[PDB]
Amino acid sequence: KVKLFRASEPILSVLMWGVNHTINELSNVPVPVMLMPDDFKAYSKIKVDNHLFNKENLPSRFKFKEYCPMVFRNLRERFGIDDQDYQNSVTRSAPINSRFLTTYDRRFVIKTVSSEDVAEMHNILKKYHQFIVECHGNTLLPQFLGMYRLTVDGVETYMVVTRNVFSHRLTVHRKYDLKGSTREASDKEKAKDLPTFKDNDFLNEGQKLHVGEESKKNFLEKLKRDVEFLAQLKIMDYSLLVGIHDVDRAEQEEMEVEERAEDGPGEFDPSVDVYAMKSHESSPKKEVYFMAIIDILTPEQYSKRFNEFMSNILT
Amino acid sequence: KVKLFRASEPILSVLMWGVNHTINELSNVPVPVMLMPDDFKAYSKIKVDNHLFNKENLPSRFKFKEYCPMVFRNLRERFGIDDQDYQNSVTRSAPINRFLTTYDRRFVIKTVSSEDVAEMHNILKKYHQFIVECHGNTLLPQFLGMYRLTVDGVETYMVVTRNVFSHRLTVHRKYDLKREASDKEKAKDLPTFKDNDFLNEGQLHVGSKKNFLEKLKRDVEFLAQLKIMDYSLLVGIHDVDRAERFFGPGEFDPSVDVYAMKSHESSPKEVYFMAIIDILNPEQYSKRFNEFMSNILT
Ligand SMILES: Nc1ncnc2c1ncn2[C@@H]1O[C@H](COP(=O)(O)O)[C@@H](O)[C@H]1O
Ligand SMILES: Nc1ncnc2c1ncn2[C@@H]1O[C@H](COP(=O)(O)O)[C@@H](O)[C@H]1O
Ligand SMILES: Nc1ncnc2c1ncn2[C@@H]1O[C@H](COP(=O)(O)O)[C@@H](O)[C@H]1O
Ligand SMILES: Nc1ncnc2c1ncn2[C@@H]1O[C@H](COP(=O)(O)O)[C@@H](O)[C@H]1O
């Protein structure tokens, strides 16, 4: 039961403490019939000073601000995310891989963003929300689950929590960040195991994703609505994040995994792995793809242009 | 299980919120092998500043400070009180009627002065050590928590203790024993009498007297050593017959009504309640006080 908030950095402990704290408090707040205008400019703030108390993991002094908590709570709900699950993903064990964090179970991504990013979120929040209502949470856009400001040692850090584009389980074997705007991977980037490849990289290696006509139609219809939505808001330079999971390769990796220790396959819950699609039955390699738009905080031409590219990615 | 923190006054909402918050926080803190000197100088402070959020019952801005939370949690344990139950008593419904009790009447919430808080810190280490040594068996006020609430820039200090009276059995007559009751006072639904009124009335029959006295004395010698005085014995009397699926006549849970004592078999049917209160020449005071109390037990 006991939550220790142990983490590699004090800022991670405070993140865990603050999500824990704000979600518990929200559980004592009725769920409204509708959101009101003020909810979009609301915040909670708490300042803690623990003297000679409760300091094994947390600093004695820190501050945690949550922006528009009623709105993000409604967003979680619309994205089919339970508040206790959310809280648990963040608090049961420390977020990992640091900033760009993942929750320990890899369900949620925690991004460190600028103050300008936080301002943009407020600017677009009402229209983002409404767009979410009318598409019933069916969208390739980033799914914003929470937005926070942490203060540790008098230093402010801003974070936005989103849903992971990738499968919280299935391994990603190759990834691209695509724009479609007149961009390749460095020798240094490629230096790392999972290099992030780009447009000219995707096109160069004759890459194509066969997903099947119904999946292709649904994907392109989301993409269309999404990119036109971002166009109207005047947003530029976002990308499509593409992950590729090789089913056979992962199966072998698992076998090797087990052998080293002792010394389904290509299946996912469309409910949890929300951007995942299977490769076309008549596809060379058995694969699973993860595709979603990212970085829509940091027009018309970019949308159409970025739309055409992504469209010619599928078959 | 939505805990709104609805109360008659904002200060009580904050109290409910604060007890809820600090108890919940403490459930994430390991119970230590012992208390250390630092724990008697410790505190938790939280300052809340909500804008356009969650201000249906709570003010948007307030502060809550808990003194020596490790010590008072150890006290709660040594007093046989589970933290969740304590938390539930304060928090499930608003405290009722500054002299409050929780809605279930188990705990009394006392508003005290800054100097009271100073004095509690002054005696806390010895009070604790004494509670250890007497194995929690004492007639002294049981100090369960101590808080400072800041609301509208105004600081309010509070101590939570166990109610001396039963949380159920109605009290039919009470005495403050160390002097009589004033005219206006004698004219109350339940006025408080004093030594003279007790002597004049000719009023307590019990097995237990020996053990109550063995308790009384130990405690009072402790209070003398602290050079404390002016404390009193708060006595309550439940007349069973007057009060007469359910709980029956004179029925009580001794683990909950810790000071309750039933009347002797050969007695004119009563449940009494007795404990020392208000402890925040003292040699003389103690022995006098201790002498007067022995004469009430037959
Ligand atoms: N209600 C709001 N509407 C628009 N921008 C905001 C709002 N609250 C904060 N910001 C911006 O978000 C950034 C961080 O704000 P602060 O929370 O005061 O650290 C700054 O660029 C602020 O101007
Ligand atoms: N929602 C997300 N899910 C998974 N990975 C992400 C997500 N957002 C960003 N990334 C990854 O983080 C890297 C850095 O993102 P950024 O720092 O925004 O460029 C990207 O190249 C992706 O690999
Ligand atoms: N069933 C298999 N399918 C594909 N590659 C395999 C298979 N079994 C072994 N390998 C590969 O052959 C090499 C030797 O693996 P091992 O038999 O585990 O020592 C490694 O590169 C493995 O990935
Ligand atoms: N622990 C207690 N349990 C029940 N009533 C109490 C307790 N302490 C004080 N009182 C009553 O609270 C009222 C005022 O307290 P005070 O003026 O502080 O002595 C008096 O009626 C006391 O009899």
Rounded Cα distance, A70 and A36, in Å: 9
CA pair distance B3, B11, nearest whole angstrom: 16
> Bridge partners of A242?
A176, A291
Tell me how far the alpha carbon of residue A252 lies from the centroid of ligand 3, in angstroms. 7
Say which of A82, A237, A248, A269 is annotated catalytic: A237
Q: At what angle do helices B114-133 and B69-78 cross, to 10 degrees?
A: 50
Contacts of the segment A99-107: beta carbons below 8 A, 24+ positions apart? A101/A12, A102/A164, A105/A168, A106/A164, A106/A166, A106/A168, A106/A169, A107/A163, A107/A164, A107/A168, A107/A272
- Residues of B with catalytic roles: 110, 230
Q: How many CA atoms lie within 13 A of B188 on its CB side?
A: 13
Q: How far is CA A125 from CA A76, A146, B51, in A?
A: 14, 12, 17
Q: Which atom of ligand 2 is nearest to the CA of A241?
A: 22
> Is residue A111 annotated as part of the catalytic site, yes or no?
yes
**Does residue A165 line the site of ligand 2, with CB under 6 A?**
yes
Q: Phi then psi for A19, rounded to 5 degrees?
A: -60, -45
* AA identity, residue B222: F
Distance CA A46, CA A288 (A): 43
Return d(Cα A170, Cα B260) in angstroms, integer. 64
Q: Which two tokens stand for residue B123?
A: 């005696």
Architecture of domain A1-164: 2-Layer Sandwich (3.30)
Is B164 flagged in the annotation as binding?
Answer: yes
**Measured from the CB, is residue B161 less than 6 Å from ligand 4?**
yes
Per the rule left: phi > 0, alpha: psi between -120 and 50, beta: everything else, B68 is left
Closest-CA residue of chain A to B69 = A53
Q: A112 CB contacts (<8 Å, ≥6 apart)? A: A99, A100, A157, A158, A159
CA of A283 from ligand 3 middle (Å) equals: 23
The answer for residues whose C-beta is within 8 angstroms of residue B163's C-beta and 6 or more apart is B101, B105, B106, B107, B108
Tell me how many degrees the CA angle A38-A42-A46 measures, rounded to the nearest 5.
155
In the beta sheet, which residues pair with residue B234? B176, B275
Q: A114-138 burial, b if ≥16 CB within 10 A, otherwise e?
A: eeebbebbeebbbebbebbeeeeee
A185 HSE (CA, 13 A, CB side):
23
Q: What are phi and psi of B14, to 5 degrees?
A: -55, -40
- Work out whether strand A196-198 and strand A174-178 pair parallel, antiparallel, or are unpaired: parallel
**H or E stretch covering B129:** helix B114-133
Give chain A's contact residues with B (Cβ, < 8 Å): 1-5, 24-25, 27-30, 38-39, 41-54, 69-70
| Rounded-to-integer distance, Cα B298 and Cα B296, Å | 6
CATH superfamily of B164-297: 2-Layer Sandwich (3.30.810.10)
Reference A48, options B45, B14, B41; nearest CA is: B45
Q: A165-175: buried (b, 16+ CB within 10 Å) or exposed (e) per residue?
A: bbbbebebbbb
Q: CA A168 to CA A81: how far, in whole Å?
A: 14
The response to whether residue A248 sits with its C-beta less than 6 Å from ligand 3 reads no
Pairing of strands B143-151, B61-67: antiparallel
Asked if residue A104 lies in contact with residue A89, where contact means CB atoms within 8 angstroms, the answer is yes
Please spell the DSSP secondary structure of B187-217, one letter per residue: SSSS-EEEHHHHHHHT------HHHHHHHHH
| DSSP assignment letter at A190 | T
In this structure, which ligand is nearest to the CA of A248? Answer: 3
Residue of B nearest to A45 (CA): B49
Under 8 Å CB-to-CB from B48, ≥6 apart: which residues?
A44, A45, A46, B58, B60, B61, B62, B63, B64
Distance of CA A242 to CAs A96, A169, A310, B137, B212, Å?
Answer: 21, 16, 10, 69, 78
Closest CA to A40 of A82, A10, A5, A75: A75
Pair B109, B163: CB distance under 8 Å: no
Residue of B nearest to A43 (CA): B51
Query: Tell me, what amino acid is at B131?
Result: I
**Nearest CA-CA distance, residue B79 and chain A, Å:** 22
**Residue bearing the CA closest to ligand 1, atom 14:** A115
| CA gyration radius, chain A | 21
C-alpha pair distances (Å), A160 with each of A40, A67, A82, A297:
16, 10, 18, 11
**Residue A51 β-bridge partners:** B43
Q: Tell me how far apart the alpha carbons of residues A240 and A220 are, in angstroms, rounded to a whole number.
A: 12
Q: Which site among B53, B70, B87, B146 would you substitute to test the A interface, given the most A Cβ atoms closer than 10 Å to its Cβ?
A: B53
Alpha helices, DSSP H only, in chain A? 10-26, 69-78, 83-91, 115-134, 199-204, 213-232, 247-262, 300-311
How was this structure determined? It was done by: X-ray
Please give the number of the atom of ligand 1 that sits closest to the Cα of A65.
17
Instruction: Please tell me which residue of chain A has the smallest CA distance to B44.
Output: A50
Mutate to test the pocket of ligand 3, among A254, A256, A259 (most ligand atoms within 8 A of CB): A256
Closest CA to B18 of B56, B53, B59: B59
Judge whether A296 and A251 are in contact, CB under 8 Å: no
Residue type at A184 in one-letter notation: E
Nearest CA to ligand 1 atom 19: A115
The closest residue, in CA terms, to atom 13 on ligand 2 is A100
Around ligand 1, the residues with Cβ closer than 6 Å are: A 41, 115-116, 118-119, 122, 149
A273 Cβ below 6 A of ligand 2: no
Q: Which of B124, B70, B82 is nearest to B106 (CA)?
A: B82
Report whether B162 contacts B258 (CB < 8 A). yes
Indicate the residue of A4, A28, A42 with minimum beta-carbon distance to B28.
A4
Domain residue extents for chain B: 1-163, 164-297
- Which residue, judged by its Cα, is nearest atom 16 of ligand 2? A295
**Tell me, what amino acid is at A70?**
M
Is residue B43 within 8 A of residue B65, CB to CB? The reply is yes
Rounded to 10 degrees, the C-alpha dihedral B52/B56/B60/B63 comes to: -150
Geometric angle at alpha carbon A41, from A36 and A46, rounded to 5°: 115
Residues A293, A297, A300, A306: what is their CA dihedral angle, to the nearest 10 degrees?
-30
Task: Give A295 to chain B, closest Cα distance, Å.
Answer: 28
Bridge partners of A196? A175
Residue type at A310?
Answer: M
**Domain covering B1-163 in this structure, CATH number:** 3.30.800.10
State in Å: Cα A38 to ligand 1 middle. Answer: 15
Question: Could you name the CATH architecture of A165-314?
Answer: 2-Layer Sandwich (3.30)
Q: Whose CA is nearest to atom 23 of ligand 3?
A: A252
Contacts (Cβ under 8 Å, ≥6 apart) of A59: A10, A13, A14, A152, A153
Instruction: Tokens for B116, please give them.
Output: 């009271």
Helices A69-78 and A83-91: crossing angle, nearest 10°? 100
Calculate how far, in angstroms, residue B137's C-alpha sits from the geometric centre of ligand 3. 72
Short-list A215, A213, A210, A214, CA closest to A286: A210
- Can you tell me the distance from the alpha carbon of A14 to that of A61, in angstroms, rounded to the nearest whole number? 10
Q: What angle do CA B255, B257, B262 make, to 5 degrees?
A: 100
Pocket test for ligand 1, best of A40, A116, A118, A297 (most atoms within 8 A of CB): A118
> Rg (Cα) of chain B, in Å, rounded?
20
How many angstroms separate the CA atoms of A76 and A137, rounded? 10
| Domain A1-164 matches domain A165-314 at the CATH topology level | no
Distances from the Cα of A165 to the Cα of A168, A169, A280, A303, B71, angstroms: 9, 12, 20, 20, 47
Q: Identify whether the C-beta of residue A300 lies closer than 8 Å to the C-beta of residue A231.
A: yes
- Nearest alpha carbon to residue A277 among A264, A263, A290: A290
Is residue B124 within 8 A of residue B39, CB to CB? The reply is no
